[PDB]
RNA sequence: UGAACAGCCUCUAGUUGAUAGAAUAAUGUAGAUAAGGGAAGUCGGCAAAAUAGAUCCGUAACUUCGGGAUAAGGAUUGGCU
RNA sequence: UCUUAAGGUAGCCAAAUGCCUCGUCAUCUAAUUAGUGACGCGCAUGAAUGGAUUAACGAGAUUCCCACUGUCCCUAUCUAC
RNA sequence: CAGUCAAGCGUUCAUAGCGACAUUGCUUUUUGAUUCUUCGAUGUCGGCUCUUCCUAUCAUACCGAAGCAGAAUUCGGUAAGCGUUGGAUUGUUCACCCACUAAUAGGGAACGUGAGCUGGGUUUAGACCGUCGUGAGACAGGUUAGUUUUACCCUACUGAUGAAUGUUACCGCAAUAGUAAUUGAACUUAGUACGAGAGGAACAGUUCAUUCGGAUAAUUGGUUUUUGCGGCUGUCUGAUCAGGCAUUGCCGCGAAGCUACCAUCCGCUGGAUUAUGGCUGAACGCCUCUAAGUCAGAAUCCAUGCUAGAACGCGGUGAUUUC
């Protein structure tokens, strides 16, 4: 086995653990917890989100 | 007339009466059979439910899906720190059922054991067993012919048990003391084995060991007082339902002209003696070990414990059994584990369980992470982290 | 399922009551499903028949085709998009949720799929994943 | 603020009275929320929820030629310069 | 072929009026004693005992659609009292 | 509802299954017949709910007979353990369909059940229309609208305490009482047996599911007063930071908590049996499951296992108070 990555915030996904949604055009997005999956259904950027790794590597830190 | 559609009754009749049971520590219904080609050992432990936790391991069965693939299931947390064995009591056979006639006791007692007997410690004058050692303080002055009594006499003897109270991380500090029904060897084997272990640690590495179907015994969680529709099942009223929706509406017909005992009305829900069958112990751990909550295919030094502890109970520093389902009972509930009562197989009770990887995340929430060094890695440095 | 059972079904958890109107997925000129029955189904008082993805059920194209609306149908359910748990202990789900006419053997009256297809219905219908253009 | 003697907050003025106190079971009365499905529930979509202002785009049958009509069905609205 | 003073003309119809009756057919729906359009010996429709028709209106009565939803599948949770 | 006789049907054969003419009966769900009771009121259809009961079996278990090659399907026997559904229209009981099913058995408890619901019906008063009547009005002829009262008592039930066995604490026993797990499907057996072919089985083993049940929250999903963090509006504290109020101001997330076949686990095995088939063996020197004896077996029954402990059934152990 191995440990994942979120789909909007980038972080180890240990199994057992999220959700995993599937879009029309069969796109996997993975999910550790409501708080990214909400947000995703919310649309959220994850460049503007700022606890995202997308925003960690969008502002160099 | 005839009741519009056939449905089930809702709720099982036999667990009538729903009432509150007796105490916090479950009674012992059965046990396995007595036979004397085994050897003289224990039939149960007392250990207390600390957590539950979810484990991956392998499917082997051959006609599965997931034959030799991944799974991930539900597994239960009983911390079993080894029992000081003292005392033993016999009983003897009737047609009146059984009946004691003799209780042994080691000559040290302990605090906890102690405690559990007072009931003021804060106000006692300490006076417990005094003269009973007084009997004792010799070699079995009036020892030996009770002993001898019960090697000519009395077919079981039960092997009395106190739990370490103080090496659970609780603030109760009174022990629990209980029976086991010996049912290895013969009977003067029994009764000699029990006279070593006076005053000696048993462990349940040396009375189980993997792959074994156990059975469970608790007086699950209190729930109150009770509606009838959480505690029965029963299908809820419509809206418009003066006086009340979440109710029972007929409770019988004209005649009989009393309320059934089969009918469902409220009363206690919850605190039940119940006792549950068809476990299989994932491991067994030493608390004097590191790496608890490592597997064979991590090797990485882990213990059991959460980072941040289980709720409402804390670490598991002594030893533990890591065990299939659903026992019931929960945190700091204390749970008496048994063995079996029936050989079965179902080529399911033979099954070798490899342990592959133990889920430590924080039971305080939704964790992200199984070790403070791992979290350390990931995020670096802090403001906190100087 | 009935007859088309190369495996059985584990248990994926209901998300499709009866009267659900279920997208139809193939090339065979329906546009939208209603669920009539489940074939296979439970029997509680006052219960519904609640399918679930690949359970074969009855179902009536609600709308399309003359010849593929109003009438009693047999079909295969393909995306449920009601989260259930696969025995590895990953939740899945979609957003939409259809499913497709078959016939009371197993083969699909269409020959073709619209959209993903989940790993228990390739599994438990072989002509799906055949015709397909993805599975997860 | 606002279309406004709407609803909300405040000034002046008057009041701070209506048995309390302790725990917060069942069932209530009043509130709400709910994942997938969407009358299948029910006699009956009762209850409840969903649309809701303003601006602009646009509007059927029928008509007593006045209406229907805010028909329907869409779009934008905050802040700062 | 008789008769009553004249013997239902324009219309409407299983209608708030139809016993048989859940009329026959069409539509509606997977499925309809409902609804809808027709047919007419219509038990017992019909002309200010007002007939028919109708825009707009209507806390009227009724069927379907769309969105909508704890009405239900199947319940659960919090708050105030 | 169920029998007796057998004219015949059943290709030939009364009884495989049927069965005319006659016949003897049995239940109270009919519907009558009666008017014994309540008219100083027994709340009244139907439905929603909920327990229990009948066997005159629809399915499940075991079997027996078939016009049983096999598949299916018909009859009969034991048993009431377990199950008997989602909808359409109808106020409906019933009906008639669409399906699901292993199967969609009859029925009861004041035509169960209204201080349990709802109020569509019928069953007042408003109003129409139709037919009759000179009118008043009449109509189980149509339709629309029409307030559904109290529990704090006693008893039952479900849970709860609780004085009296020298006191007190602990460990148990078990007299008693209820009992539950139930039902399919896939593979393989096997295109095997069997069958001219077409067709086409069952036992065992493995793997999941339906219905019930009982737990549990690790994850998932639900709930937000953690008013926890963040956002937004209007007004108030001169301004900011911070906040006051809008009967929880709204909204996203959110622990702790509780909770779903909406989450996962789990539902033990020994015996005595009935129908049924037999062994030995008479009476009845032959024979025979029967008369005496005896074997095998059902979801039965009794146990195990489970469920509270007789609060007047018991056992053991411990310590039992002084200036």
Same mark, same amino acid.
């Given at each position: ?24 055009? #069969? ?8 708080? #990214? ?25 | ?15 009538? /009466? ?13 046990? /396995? ?12 432990? %007392? ?6 936790? +979810? ?6 069965? /051959? ?30 056979? *009737? /047609?009146?059922?059984?009946?004691? %006639? ?24 300490? !006076?417990?067993? *005094? ?35 103080? !090496? ?72 418009? +339902?003066?006086?009340? %929706? ?23 829900? &919850? ?13 067994? &751990? ?93 995020? &670096?440095? %802090?403001?906190?982290?100087? | ?17 009866? $009267? ?8 065979? $000129? ?23 993805? =690949? ?15 109003? @009438? ?9 998009? @009601? ?22 053997? =197993? ?30």
């Amino acid at each position: 086995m191995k440990v994942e990555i979120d789909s909007f915030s980038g972080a180890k996904i240990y199994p057992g653990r999220g959700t995993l949604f599937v879009r029309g055009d #069969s796109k996997i997005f993975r999910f550790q917890n409501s708080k #990214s999956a909400s947000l995703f259904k919310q649309r959220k950027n994850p460049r503007r989100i700022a606890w995202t790794v997308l925003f960690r590597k969008h502002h160099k830190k | 007339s005839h009741r519009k559609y056939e449905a089930p009754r809702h709720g099982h009749l036999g667990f009538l /009466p729903r009432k509150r049971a007796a105490s916090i520590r479950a009674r012992v219904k059965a046990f /396995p059979k007595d036979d004397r080609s085994k050897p003289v050992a224990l039939t149960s432990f %007392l250990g207390y439910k600390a957590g539950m936790t +979810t484990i991956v391991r392998d499917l082997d069965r /051959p006609g599965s899906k997931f034959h030799k693939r991944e799974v991930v299931e539900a597994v239960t947390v009983v911390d079993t720190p080894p029992v000081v064995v003292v005392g033993v009591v016999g009983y003897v056979e *009737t /047609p009146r059922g059984l009946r004691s %006639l003799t209780t042994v006791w080691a000559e040290h007692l302990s605090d906890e054991v102690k405690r559990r007997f007072y009931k003021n410690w804060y106000k006692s004058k300490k !006076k417990a067993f *005094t003269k009973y050692s007084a009997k004792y303080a010799q070699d079995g002055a009036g020892i030996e012919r009770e002993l001898a009594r019960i090697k000519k006499y009395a077919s079981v003897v039960r092997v009395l048990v106190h739990t370490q109270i103080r !090496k659970t991380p609780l603030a109760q500090k009174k022990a629990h003391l209980a029976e086991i029904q010996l049912n290895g060897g013969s009977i003067s084997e029994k009764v000699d084995w029990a006279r070593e272990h006076f005053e000696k640690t048993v462990a349940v590495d040396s009375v189980f060991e993997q792959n074994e179907m156990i059975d469970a015994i608790a007086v699950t969680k209190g729930h109150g007082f009770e509606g009838v529709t959480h505690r029965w099942g029963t299908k809820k009223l419509p809206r418009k +339902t003066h006086r009340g %929706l979440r109710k029972v509406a007929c409770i019988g017909a004209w005649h009989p002209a009393h309320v059934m005992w089969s009918v469902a009305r409220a009363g206690q829900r &919850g605190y039940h003696s119940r006792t549950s069958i068809n476990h299989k112990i994932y491991r067994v &751990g030493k608390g004097d070990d590191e790496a608890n909550g490592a597997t064979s295919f991590d090797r990485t030094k882990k213990t059991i414990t959460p980072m941040g502890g289980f709720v409402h109970y804390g670490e598991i520093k002594n030893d533990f059994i890591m065990v299939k389902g659903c026992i019931p009972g929960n945190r700091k509930r204390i749970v008496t584990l048994r063995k079996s009562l029936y050989t079965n197989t179902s080529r399911k009770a033979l099954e070798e369980v490899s342990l592959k990887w133990i889920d430590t995340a924080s039971k305080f929430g939704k964790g992200r992470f199984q070790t403070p060094a791992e979290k350390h890695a990931f995020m &670096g440095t %802090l403001k906190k982290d100087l | 399922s009935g007859n088309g059972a190369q495996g059985t079904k584990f248990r994926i958890s209901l998300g499709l009551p009866v $009267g659900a109107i279920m997208n139809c997925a193939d090339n065979s $000129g329906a546009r939208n499903l209603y669920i009539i029955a489940v074939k296979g189904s439970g029997s509680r008082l006052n219960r519904l028949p609640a399918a679930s993805l =690949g359970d074969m059920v009855m179902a009536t194209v609600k709308k399309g085709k003359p010849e593929l609306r109003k @009438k009693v149908m047999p079909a295969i359910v393909v995306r449920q998009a @009601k989260s259930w748990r696969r025995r590895d202990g990953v939740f899945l789900y979609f957003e939409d949720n259809a499913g497709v006419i078959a016939n009371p053997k =197993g083969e699909m009256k269409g020959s073709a799929i619209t959209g993903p297809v989940g790993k228990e219905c390739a599994d438990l219908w072989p002509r799906v994943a055949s015709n397909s253009g993805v599975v997860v």
